[PDB]
Amino acid sequence: TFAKIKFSAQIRLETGLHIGGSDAFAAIGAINSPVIKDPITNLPIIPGSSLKGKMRTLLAKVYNEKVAEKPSDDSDILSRLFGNSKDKRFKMGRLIFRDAFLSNADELDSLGVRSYTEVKFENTIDRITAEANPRQIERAIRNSTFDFELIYEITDENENQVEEDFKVIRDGLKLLELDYLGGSGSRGYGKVAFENLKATTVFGNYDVKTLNELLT
């Protein structure tokens, strides 16, 4: 068979997220580090490169039994899952991390929210001379959702990695429920929460009855 499987999920923000964007020289008093927004709707967009590369750099610590000097040196548990540039059979690596374009806006404007991107203020104080240095950085608002989805494709090339990859990706989702996923994380941004990890086999003879009993 050929089994493409779609992982419907709800990225709900808490401690609202900022992904970087155009640090091309913006206006004077305006936002210094603006968020990347989808140019049709101007809602915040969490692109798939942040998700895939962040889950790459976080599953580095989990499933690379050896220390990895670079993402080419990922093991053959992650090279088949996130792609690899120098491996023989692990190019085109089976996971299309689709984006999310701020799914709810009829809900988030039903709550009395002016704009979906707050402009939180920040500065820095040097320890010597204590000079201030202010900045206005853009973030998405707190209780947003994000209709995020994966595409895992099973081409009968594996035939044994049915659940050898979902214990990896589900615990990566747990990592992202703990770690920040995007932007100035160590100041406490991002903090996505993954809700309703709904897998559905959009192509293939396959059941989720052995899948969502682990993915909860």
Next chain:
Amino acid sequence: SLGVRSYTEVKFENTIDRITAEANPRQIERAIRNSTFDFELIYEITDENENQVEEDFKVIRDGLKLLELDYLGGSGSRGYGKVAFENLKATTVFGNYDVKTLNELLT
């Protein structure tokens, strides 16, 4: 009328090194969301193919049911896909074979 300056956006990107932890930024140019493109696919029917023409029309349709589940582009494992067809009809163009056996299977 939706309101956009140019139809090509610049998705900024980088490459955080795994040990050095130094970024490496990119300016990847993309074409913006929900742009609808003219797409036409000329199938041609000969007398030898006339056994499995209707079979092959459940392959091209199945070839576009999968292209809405794959990226149809490049660097498409990080998004850049989900390319969804619409108005997927089947007209006829200089050929006297009725397309009424097909249009309920595509649309």
Next chain:
Amino acid sequence: TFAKIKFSAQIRLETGLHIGGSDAFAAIGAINSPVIKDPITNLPIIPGSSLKGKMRTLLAKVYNEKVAEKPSDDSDILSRLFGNSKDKRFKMGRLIFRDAFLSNADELDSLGVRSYTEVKFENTIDRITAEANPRQIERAIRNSTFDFELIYEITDENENQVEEDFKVIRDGLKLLELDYLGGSGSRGYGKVAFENLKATTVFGNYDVKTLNELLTA
């Protein structure tokens, strides 16, 4: 292996904190210096950025042997907790300081509180000619609590330095009650406590019971 532990505290205020608000469309005879705010519910929250930048100088007053003159010159007991911008292996900082949210909305409605902020007139009396120059700087109310989350890392590069930095982190927890969490400082505005410490490993295999000795004591 790779573990990841969680430090949960309750920032209970005493005469709470003004962290400068966002909107400039303020007022004439009302708030002209608001507090930072979660814009979906307009709650005063404590961001993790003020916590990190306060603890940076508060622990650099203790653990720096050298004078700073700059950031990215901390004494490397902090530069693995708060990160350098320059050191080759210490670009990251392994401490995540999540934004503390105002928790006890339920008990502070039992207390006769109209709204969860206040307007505190704080004028500038001119030292000659005695004329007044008012300001209305808005602060969080006196006894709110905040869910100060915290997340610490454990890798195959932290053999014994998991517990080396804990009494460096706890130095920040019992020196934050020596300083004022950002605000105006010398008019109160920061005296706090950190109730109900419950430290556990939210990821990875690490012990919670032998871990629980040096935190609250």
Next chain:
Amino acid sequence: ILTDENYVDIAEKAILKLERNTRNRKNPDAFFLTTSKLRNLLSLTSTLFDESKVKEYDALLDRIAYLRVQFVYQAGREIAVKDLIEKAQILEALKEIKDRETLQRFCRYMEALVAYFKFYG
């Protein structure tokens, strides 16, 4: 009545329309209205202007209903504030409080009144 695009101008051409001190001819054409007697008007509104954002208007309408009586009372204590509330129709605008956005619009209109009074004299 006042809407989003006119409420400055509603408070513009009303301020040139009020009378001034025809007598007391030292720095003449000065307002009978004094600045403290207009800050007593605005300070009622400006607390509700920020209470409106946190709360909701249906949990707020009682204080604007009493603020009606407050503008009556401050009008009832002087010959200038009795003149101000109708030469600039604040008591007309106080009958239309229909949502929180109109409430904040009326508060910004009061701020425009204070601003255009401070702009002159």
Next chain:
Amino acid sequence: ILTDENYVDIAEKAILKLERNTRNRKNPDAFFLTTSKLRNLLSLTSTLFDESKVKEYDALLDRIAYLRVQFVYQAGREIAVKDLIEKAQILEALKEIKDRETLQRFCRYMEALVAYFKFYG
């Protein structure tokens, strides 16, 4: 007035035309108007100019007249900002807000004002 191309020179010689510290020549040719009496105005236009690219024009038209409130108000406190709005035709250009585009253009004019105000000393 303000178009798409002419406003930067307008802001330039509206910074030049402003009068400076003539008496008390302690670092002279310095503005009586303080920079914190300009940045408190431009912090309105910046929170318009970056929340204009998200929204409509006709959703922003509550804050747009509040700009004309606050410019009148801060012009009424110091004589320097009243001098500024006389040199720099701010209130005469706030009538020229008809869409998202001219609003963003006026905010670029305000940024040019603050830029050339910081430029001279």
Next chain:
Amino acid sequence: GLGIKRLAVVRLDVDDLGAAFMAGFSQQGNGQYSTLSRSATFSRSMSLFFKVYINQFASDKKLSIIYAGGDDVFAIGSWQDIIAFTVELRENFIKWTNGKLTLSAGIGLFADKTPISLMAHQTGELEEAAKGNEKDSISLFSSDYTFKFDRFITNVYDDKLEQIRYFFNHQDERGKNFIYKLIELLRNHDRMNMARLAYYLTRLEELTRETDRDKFKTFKNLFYSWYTNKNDKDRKEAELALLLYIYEIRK
């Protein structure tokens, strides 16, 4: 480790060697010098320059003259040596040819292991865009960087690049982020960006330390000179000077 792993390809062309050969000396005089001996001597001089002497200008510099001669030089190599080799080739060609017969080179940057007929085509495209500029031009890294050579080596590679290099060598606050923002303000450049740059330089003016502060003050005085110069002959020059400096200090 300072410098970027590039390889630049220059394709010169003598500007109308067909017209300098066919008509040439016949412009001078009443046909007194419209002889055969002068044309043979001139073409042997072009042969002796472009077929012998290029191995002298390429001697210490690290490159490969793939093809040379007649009215074409296709020389691949490393980009500092390629730029310096074009500099020395024209600055001794106008000593060789008295400033007459200006050469119109085109230098493109190309990454490591990119194919060469893909690369010779782009080099030829930049070459013909430099050809049609005027009588002569250099085209550097793209057809929008098209200057006269008399403007390129004197202003950029002698005046501006050394000021830019010395200004960033003898200080360590303003690293590469400031150079990148200067390049972007040089590249976008509407009327409002001159105001944004006048804000940027003045905001950085009082931010540098007091010791090496007037170096920044004379550099912003010397930078706002060419940025707002109202000519566009002194602006893309400065953007290319900053691009050359960034490529020279690439880590």
Next chain:
Amino acid sequence: NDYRTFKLSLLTLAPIHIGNGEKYTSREFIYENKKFYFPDMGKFYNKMVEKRLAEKFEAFLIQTRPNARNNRLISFLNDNRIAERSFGGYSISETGLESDKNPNSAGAINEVNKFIRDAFGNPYIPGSSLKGAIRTILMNTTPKWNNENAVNDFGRFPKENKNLIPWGPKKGKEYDDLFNAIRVSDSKPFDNKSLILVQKWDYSAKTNKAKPLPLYRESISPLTKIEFEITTTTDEAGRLIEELGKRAQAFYKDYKAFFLSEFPDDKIQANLQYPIYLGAGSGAWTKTLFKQADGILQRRYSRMKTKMVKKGVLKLTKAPLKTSLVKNHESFYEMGKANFMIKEI
């Protein structure tokens, strides 16, 4: 640890009012027992509209009525029998000496400036109050800071220099910011029933008269103790808080000979501890530089309310007696004369 804490405790010899700006106006309180009542007037009006007489409430508020015992809303709440007293609010006791020569007027007062209260409804004293009180003492009792707090040749007797004390980043120097090392924390919220609404009482110079004023600010009941946390981290401001025990008595001594002399010491209080002046009504000399604003402070008042000649008129109050702290009859207190003691903990 270089953070040298102290602890300042403040007894209230005098009526002490601070802050909060807002007030309850003339027709905005209830006096039917011996206790003043301040409900929420919006809550009161919204409950009174169920009694449907609110249209008369429109005419009651503009009612210019003599014999003001019927003016102050007791007549609205006894003439039409609305006497529920369930309105959300806080009750306080009366002074007793609140009005002079006004029989049955224990309720015909007009304006009560609020004391500062937090969102809980329990009044405290903020540390900005004590720090503003401290800055005048520590400015006048140091001779290097008393010379040029003057015109700066900028306007018409405008303001202080504000530069005699180190202030701000000062880009290029160390961290100076001297007053940041005096971290005057806010007091703990005490009992609600320690408020008296004392009247301002002017005692005129060159006129032996005690003409009172119609502004009864809610002050603090006498002889109550207040806590204050004060920390120090720089040695110079630390030495200033150490030398407070000399500078307070020195400022009060040089302020007595500058101002309090020629005035009779019967109404003037006694110290009995470390004396200090807190806010809202203690005279501008307790809020300024007394030997610097001779003709500079009083130059502004060229109005209907000019300070008599040069220097302010003495301000007194009226509040009942405990323990004496008054040192005469008729209960003329001094409106802001507080006591403190200090000890490093």
Next chain:
RNA sequence: ACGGAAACGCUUUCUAGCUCGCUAUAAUUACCCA
């Protein structure tokens, strides 16, 4: 019986790392108006 048939400019890559909205600031001053 088309220099034509067969040919995805494609694979990998967190716009990231560091940064207190901070520094000074008694809601106060004056004594009255018919």
